Design a protein around this ligand. Structure first.
Ligand SMILES: CC(=O)N[C@@H]1[C@@H](O[C@@H]2O[C@H](C(=O)O)[C@@H](O[C@@H]3O[C@H](CO)[C@@H](O)[C@H](O[C@@H]4O[C@H](C(=O)O)[C@@H](O)[C@H](O)[C@H]4O)[C@H]3NC(C)=O)[C@H](O)[C@H]2O)[C@H](O)[C@@H](CO)O[C@H]1O
Length: 719
């Protein structure tokens, strides 16, 4: 037809990619097989009675917005197969008619301009409109330009403003980040379908705002943080949608009369390198950045990671030169480092499958293991650490007066209460740790690293910001950093000065000033590790094999605990600076995804967990231990002997551990008193420090969590 159909043709190549299909292509044929079965199920179950209440019974309750999107997504699947020469439904008269028909019926009795949002606005302005655009785009050769307009009319009624969503409501909000991108997949495509030029130009102009880094509110920050939903760390869910959708759109947008300036898009590489890259470990997308998505059974870390990777790859393909090359190497090495998840299980279009296949087999693209790195995402209170030498990742999940602890929205993530209360993540040889039903089987009252009372929590509860702004990380280099959280629990009955000292190949956990004014007992979960029936651990307490049971066994006078696997890369050792009183247990924990997410399956799931905790029976209590992963038993025993004097201090005003091997100090000062460290120097300001002694010199890394600022050396360091 015209230039719009041209772009609409490019879109089809991106969202389905029938033109690249190849039956002799294993991965492609697998996805085709999947779509064939989908429309087969849809067709064999659609209602074909004279006068019907619903198109599909499973999605009849049209009061539930979700049923509109699910119903239309089914027609998009039919539209994909009907235009695929290799599909059994290719140009099928029945399939063509049911799509056209279904569009009309849905339009007649369910979704039209004369209707109003009922349920989630999201489906009315994003979910459904996208499915409609895609369906009309794929089958434009079967619809009249007039019918197309007719069917996208309702989209214009609900989403008239490319800059605001929920415009038909009493409180529309400005589209930013992920939402802004979907606004493009809604109005740019719909604009294309309607041959509406003003719509295209204004939506693109509106989309261009996503390329702006922010220093407040929602968006990407200079330090790599990405905030969404007012104050929630969301690089891993909304960031996904952002990069995923934008990467699909850009190729199309760029071929219009309103291409986005190159210098304007250059910021995308900032997101990739500073925001996304650090959150990817062995093909897994750190859960601490995925908000409520963690409660979705079909979006575990490795799966969520491919959403980002496919977006990054599309961007690399859109680039050229070293940029294309480096991005390709980035995607290639990450995917190849994933021995647990098959990346193709989440490449849902032929072009995406194709791109990935050529990348993996192109010998010209280097795939070299990622180097060590430490990202201090202070603008979202998270820290990601990775050691390339020992091969383990570490995630520190916190929150402050600037951020919400956990998101429970739309009945999702009902029990994430403590996932940001100083929760830590360890990524080692067991790539499936946080997968295979970890979230619905993990005991939510004992999130690893967290200090909490055992009071009962309500599923109906929702997030809160922390009273204190004294939460933050001061990074010295790629292997060393220190963090602290002026912790107070959800009902202000317990406090604790929790601090972490990341020192290259280990992390020390220090807690002091632990107080409890309530009646419930207080304890810190040193860990709750999910086990693999295939790789059993040999537990040692004080280097003596211990036999754990579902019943908590107490181990007083503990100097160390060691979990031994046949794979050094799965070993976890804990050295207690001062002999401590801990309790351990290994028990089968059962649950269902529905428990933490109403819309998930109620199917029972179960996993075996090893729980280690330390009770706090008095005020002024404390804890102190070093987490040492990926070393064998003899090396762990020898190391804890060397660290016998690493703890420099752990009280209510000062906390610090020292790495003699590196000549690095980790320090946290809660007050402005003069602290003399190791009889060598003085730290003078309240805040977080990471210092390295280089012979006669001292490299200083100071951070003031409250003002979110560093400071001149002479202000905080002396001698
Ligand atoms: C209660 C209310 O209306 N609160 C508003 C808040 O509304 C919420 O906005 C979200 C949003 O996207 O901004 C909505 O989140 C999305 O809901 C979808 C339907 O349940 C769900 O499918 C989305 O999940 C993603 O879907 C993608 C897709 O289907 O294409 C997937 O490709 C993607 O992998 C998957 O994660 C879900 N989005 C995310 C990122 O999880 C939420 O339902 C809706 O209630 C407004 O946004 C804010 C404005 O800042 O104000 C509140 O008051």
């Amino acid at each position: 037809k015209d230039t719009y159909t041209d772009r609409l043709d490019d879109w089809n190549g991106i969202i389905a990619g029938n033109q690249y299909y190849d039956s002799k292509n294993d991965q492609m044929a697998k996805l085709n097989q999947e779509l064939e079965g989908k429309v087969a199920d849809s067709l064999s179950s659609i209602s074909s009675q004279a006068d019907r209440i619903y198109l599909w019974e499973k999605f009849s309750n049209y009061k539930t917005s979700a049923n509109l999107t699910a119903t239309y997504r089914k027609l998009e699947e039919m539209a994909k197969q009907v235009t695929n020469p290799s599909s059994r439904y290719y140009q099928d008269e029945t399939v063509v008619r049911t799509v056209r028909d279904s569009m009309e019926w849905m339009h007649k009795h369910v979704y039209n301009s004369e209707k109003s949002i009922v349920g989630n606005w999201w489906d009315y302005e994003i979910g459904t409109p996208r499915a409609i655009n895609n369906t009309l785009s794929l089958m434009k050769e079967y619809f009249s330009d007039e019918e197309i307009k007719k069917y996208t009319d309702v989209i214009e009624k609900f989403v008239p403003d490319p800059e605001h969503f929920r415009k038909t409501t009493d409180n529309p909000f400005k589209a930013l980040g992920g939402n802004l991108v979907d606004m493009g997949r809604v109005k740019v495509i719909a604009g294309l379908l309607r041959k509406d030029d003003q719509e295209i130009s204004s939506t693109i102009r509106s989309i261009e705002q996503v390329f702006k880094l922010v220093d407040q509110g929602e968006g990407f920050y200079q330090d790599g943080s990405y905030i969404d939903h007012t104050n929630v760390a969301y690089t891993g869910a909304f960031g996904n949608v952002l990069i995923d959708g934008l990467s699909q759109l850009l190729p199309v947008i760029q071929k219009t009369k309103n291409p986005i300036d190159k210098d304007k898009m250059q910021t995308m590489y900032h997101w990739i390198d500073k925001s996304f890259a650090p959150l990817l470990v062995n093909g897994e997308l750190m859960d601490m950045s995925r908000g409520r998505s963690i409660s979705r059974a079909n979006s575990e870390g490795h799966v969520a990671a491919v959403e980002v990777l496919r977006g990054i790859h599309r961007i690399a393909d859109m680039s050229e030169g070293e940029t294309k090359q480096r991005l390709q190497s980035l995607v290639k090495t990450i995917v190849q480092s994933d021995s647990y998840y098959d990346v193709f299980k989440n490449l849902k279009t032929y072009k995406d499958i194709s791109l990935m296949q050529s990348l993996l087999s192109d010998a010209g693209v280097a795939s070299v293991p990622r180097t060590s790195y430490l990202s201090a995402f202070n603008k979202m209170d998270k820290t990601a650490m990775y050691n390339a030498e020992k091969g383990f990742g570490f995630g520190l999940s916190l929150f402050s007066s600037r951020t919400l602890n956990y998101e429970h929205m739309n009945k999702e993530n009902k029990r994430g209460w403590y996932t940001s209360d100083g929760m830590f993540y360890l990524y080692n040889g067991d790539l499936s740790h946080y997968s295979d039903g970890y979230w619905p089987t993990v005991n939510p009252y004992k999130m690893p690293g967290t200090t909490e009372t055992d009071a009962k929590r309500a599923d109906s509860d929702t997030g809160k910001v922390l009273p204190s702004a004294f939460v933050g990380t001061s990074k010295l280099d790629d292997a060393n950093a220190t963090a602290t959280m002026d912790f107070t629990n959800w009902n202000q009955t317990l406090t604790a000065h929790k601090s972490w000292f990341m020192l290259k190949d280990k992390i020390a956990f220090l807690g002091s000033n632990i107080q409890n004014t309530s009646t419930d007992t207080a304890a810190t979960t040193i860990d709750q590790r999910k086990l693999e029936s295939s790789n059993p651990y040999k537990v040692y307490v004080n280097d003596k094999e211990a036999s754990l049971t579902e019943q908590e066994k107490d181990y007083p006078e503990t100097q160390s605990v060691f979990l031994e696997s046949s794979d050094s890369k799965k070993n976890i050792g804990y050295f207690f600076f001062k002999k401590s009183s801990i309790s351990m247990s290994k028990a089968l924990q059962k649950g269902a995804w529905k428990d933490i997410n109403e819309g998930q399956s109620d199917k029972e799931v179960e996993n075996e967990f090893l729980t280690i905790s330390q009770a706090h029976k008095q005020n002024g209590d404390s804890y102190g231990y070093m987490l040492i992963p990926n070393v064998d038993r003899a090396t762990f025993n020898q190391m804890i002997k060397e660290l016998e004097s690493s703890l420099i201090e752990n009280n209510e005003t000062l906390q610090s551990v020292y790495d003699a091997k590196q000549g690095v100090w980790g320090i946290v000062k809660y007050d402005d008193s003069v602290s003399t460290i190791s009889n060598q120097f003085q730290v003078l300001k309240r805040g977080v420090y990471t210092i390295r002694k280089e012979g006669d010199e001292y490299k200083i890394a100071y951070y003031n969590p409250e003002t979110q600022e560093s400071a001149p050396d002479q202000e905080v360091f002396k001698k």
